[PDB]
Ligand binder design. Structure first.
Ligand SMILES: [Mg+2]
Ligand SMILES: [Mg+2]
Ligand SMILES: [Mg+2]
Ligand SMILES: [Mg+2]
Ligand SMILES: [Mg+2]
Ligand SMILES: [Mg+2]
Ligand SMILES: [Mg+2]
Ligand SMILES: [Mg+2]
Ligand SMILES: [Mg+2]
Ligand SMILES: [Mg+2]
Ligand SMILES: [Mg+2]
Ligand SMILES: [Mg+2]
Ligand SMILES: [Mg+2]
Ligand SMILES: [Mg+2]
Ligand SMILES: [Mg+2]
Ligand SMILES: [Mg+2]
Ligand SMILES: [Mg+2]
Ligand SMILES: [Mg+2]
Ligand SMILES: [Mg+2]
Ligand SMILES: [Mg+2]
Ligand SMILES: [Mg+2]
Ligand SMILES: [Mg+2]
Ligand SMILES: [Mg+2]
Ligand SMILES: [Mg+2]
Ligand SMILES: [Mg+2]
Ligand SMILES: [Mg+2]
Ligand SMILES: [Mg+2]
Ligand SMILES: [Mg+2]
Ligand SMILES: [Mg+2]
Lengths: 58, 129, 99, 25, 108, 142
RNA sequence: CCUUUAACGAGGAUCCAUUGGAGGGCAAGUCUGGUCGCAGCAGCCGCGGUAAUUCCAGCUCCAAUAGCGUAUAUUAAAGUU
RNA sequence: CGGGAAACCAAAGUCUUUGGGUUCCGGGGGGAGUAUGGUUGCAAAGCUGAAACUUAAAGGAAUUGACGGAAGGGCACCACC
RNA sequence: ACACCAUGG
């Protein structure tokens, strides 16, 4: 703590800036739904017991 | 007091069926009780019945089969007019394949299945299934 | 919640019963709530009977008794251990304890 | 007994306030 | 004060201590009097009294009694309010008095 | 334990239901007229006002923070309310003596969360929203 | 304006889809940096006191989609009239 | 018998298989049986009786612990005699 | 046939 601990915008005013790394255009409309169908009903590799959440970092 | 005679006739029949009794006595007798019992017996929910005759209102002895599941009364005699009948037999009856609603029409005391067959409404008395 | 069917009192089909005074407490407890006990003891003693049955100028003299009817508080009787606690299922036994 | 003592204190305060309101009026 | 409280972080005392001075929008103060609800009356060592609040970090971990030196962080928008950030012990208070930090109106 | 079933009791049933509806809390609150009077909004969803000065509402015991509310005076009534400025460093966008548009907090009459005595939030600072200033999509006009 | 029609008019880097969220209710990450009961979040329960699944961001993922969020009135849920 | 959250109840039973007749009365916890108007009384007071505001629980029955300046039976020179 | 026995970072 250094000076007026009740100051506003403290944490958002000392966060390191990061530029967005983006490039590839995301698909839209029917094309996204077609991709989501493939990615879970026909692109599959099954196992007993294991957990397979779509964003699992573990 | 006994405001309603049919109500307690049917509740005393139904309290004994839950108990396995082969017979009941119900008193006083009445014209509407005998007609309701005849309607309930024509279908096969009760056996024969005998009327004991004092010089007063009288008493009835009913032979109970084990087929009766529940019989009961609708407390004010509402008017029912052949279009309310479907909404009535969707509250009182347990299925669409069995169980009857008894109503008094200007052509006698009968069931709903005969009321629609003769195109008549009337007043609801009770039901049995 | 309701610990006793009789509310811990013998009253049934009455509005009121006359109070009485707890014999050591001087409390004010209803007659059919209080804890009663009728004691009948020898006037002289149980040990000192010989010193008196020998000094008596009468050959066959029967010593009198001393009858007292005691009425007790609930608290005051629990404190003198006239009564105790019981199990939830044993409170329903209302027979006088075996002699 | 906080219940009946609350009752008595409120009764006292209300009697006082009513008597004052009537006197000054 | 003794208790069965062997639990909790057991012992946070040492013979070593290092000073901390003022910063931007941060003053010293002297506790004027104690209030309830964790609040406090204070007095900045120059001007206003600036009623203070003992922040979530200090609650029941470092006690503040009346008439002691403290370091409070002022609020920009409000003026009469502040939050007690740090407490100064007797030796450190006299040290600040030596370094000329606090205008010597209040003593230890 | 008893209700009149008889055939000519429509008046008794209707009158008893009408009499007893006045014990439902929300029914009475909506049909009496005292809440529409005591409501600092005139029964409206939003309201414009002028900022008197910013304040530091301290949150309730199990939490610790200083919630940074503002004190507004409403144009149409003249009433003084307290409103909340929700985001990281959004209190810098609100000077004094500038008209702000506030809305409700989301419970229709009550304090939300750990904040005591506050029932509204600020949604517009000066014809520009606090969510365009928070993302840089806009900026204050001076 | 639409419709009918010429003549031009696409390689995906632009002829570039958003609005909300990722502890539970409730579909989706114990991934990486920053802050350290502060800033803030949070309809409710609850997150933050130096190893944050909830704050600020980056990446990834979920929902509806040319729409999505918020405040209020009201209906169903309410067999809590 | 059957009912009920259970304690318990031959009634607190004959209830999603819900309808014998009828009067009174309740709608989360506070503010509060308060303020105010009316009425009664010699007085004390009785009857009728809100709202703004505030809050995420207040509460019921039973279970397992811990505690008791509660009772019964035992025990230890880290207890006494 | 019952002296005193208050409070808790
Ligand atoms: Mg008890
Ligand atoms: Mg009495
Ligand atoms: Mg009431
Ligand atoms: Mg309320
Ligand atoms: Mg047009
Ligand atoms: Mg996004
Ligand atoms: Mg978010
Ligand atoms: Mg995130
Ligand atoms: Mg969620
Ligand atoms: Mg989930
Ligand atoms: Mg960290
Ligand atoms: Mg982290
Ligand atoms: Mg509704
Ligand atoms: Mg409601
Ligand atoms: Mg009864
Ligand atoms: Mg009955
Ligand atoms: Mg209530
Ligand atoms: Mg009343
Ligand atoms: Mg009055
Ligand atoms: Mg809470
Ligand atoms: Mg209990
Ligand atoms: Mg227990
Ligand atoms: Mg013992
Ligand atoms: Mg020994
Ligand atoms: Mg010794
Ligand atoms: Mg002690
Ligand atoms: Mg004390
Ligand atoms: Mg105390
Ligand atoms: Mg304590």
């Amino acid at each position: 703590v250094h000076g007026s601990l009740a100051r506003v915008g403290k944490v958002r005013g000392q966060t390191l800036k990061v530029a967005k790394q983006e490039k590839k255009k995301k698909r839209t409309g029917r094309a996204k739904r077609r991709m989501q169908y493939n990615r879970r009903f026909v692109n599959v590799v099954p196992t007993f017991g294991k957990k397979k959440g779509p964003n699992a970092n573990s | 007091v006994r405001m309603n005679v049919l109500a307690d006739a049917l509740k005393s029949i139904n309290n004994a069926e839950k108990r396995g009794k082969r017979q009941v006595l119900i008193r006083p007798c009445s014209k509407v009780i005998v007609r309701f019992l005849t309607v309930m017996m024509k279908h096969g929910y009760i056996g024969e019945f005998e009327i004991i005759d004092d010089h007063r209102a009288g008493k009835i002895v009913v032979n109970l089969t084990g087929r009766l599941n529940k019989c009961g009364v609708i407390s004010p005699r509402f008017d029912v007019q052949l279009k309310d009948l479907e909404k009535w037999q969707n509250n009182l009856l347990p299925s669409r394949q069995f169980g009857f609603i008894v109503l008094t029409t200007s052509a006698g005391i009968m069931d709903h299945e005969e009321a629609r067959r003769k195109h008549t409404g009337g007043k609801i008395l009770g039901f049995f299934f | 919640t309701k610990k006793r069917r009789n509310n811990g009192r013998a009253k049934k089909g009455r509005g009121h019963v006359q109070p009485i005074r707890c014999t050591n407490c001087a409390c004010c407890v209803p007659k059919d709530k209080a804890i009663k006990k009728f004691v009948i003891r020898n006037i002289v003693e149980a040990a000192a009977v010989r010193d008196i049955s020998e000094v008596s100028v009468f050959d066959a003299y029967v010593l009198p008794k001393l009858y007292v009817k005691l009425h007790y508080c609930v608290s005051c009787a629990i404190h003198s251990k006239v009564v105790r606690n019981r199990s939830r299922e044993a409170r329903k036994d209302r027979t006088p304890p075996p002699r | 007994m906080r219940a009946k003592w609350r009752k008595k204190r409120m009764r006292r305060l209300k009697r006082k306030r009513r008597k004052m309101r009537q006197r000054s009026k | 004060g003794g208790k069965n409280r062997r639990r909790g972080k057991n012992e946070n005392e040492s013979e070593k201590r290092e000073l901390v001075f003022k910063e931007d929008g941060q003053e010293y103060a002297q506790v004027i009097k104690m209030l309830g609800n964790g609040r406090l009356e204070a007095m900045c060592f120059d001007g206003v009294k600036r009623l203070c609040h003992i922040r979530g970090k200090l609650r029941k971990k470092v006690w503040i009694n009346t008439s002691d030196i403290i370091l409070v962080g002022l609020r920009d928008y409000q003026d009469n309010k502040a939050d007690v950030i740090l407490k100064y012990n007797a030796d450190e208070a006299r040290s600040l008095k030596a370094y000329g930090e606090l205008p010597e109106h209040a003593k230890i | 334990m008893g209700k009149c079933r008889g055939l000519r009791t429509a008046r008794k049933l209707r009158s008893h239901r009408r009499d007893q509806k006045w014990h439902d809390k929300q029914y009475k609150k909506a049909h009496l007229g005292t809440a529409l009077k005591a409501n600092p909004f005139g029964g409206a969803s939003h309201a414009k006002g002028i900022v008197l000065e910013k304040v530091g509402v301290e949150a309730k015991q199990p939490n610790s923070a200083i919630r940074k509310c503002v004190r507004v005076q409403l144009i149409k009534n003249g009433k003084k309310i307290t409103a909340f400025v929700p985001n990281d460093g959004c209190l810098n966008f609100i000077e004094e003596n500038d008209e702000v548009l506030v809305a409700g907090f989301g419970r229709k009459g009550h304090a939300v969360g750990d904040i005591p005595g506050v029932r509204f939030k600020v949604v517009k600072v000066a014809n520009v929203s606090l969510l365009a200033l928070y993302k840089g999509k806009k900026e204050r006009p001076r």
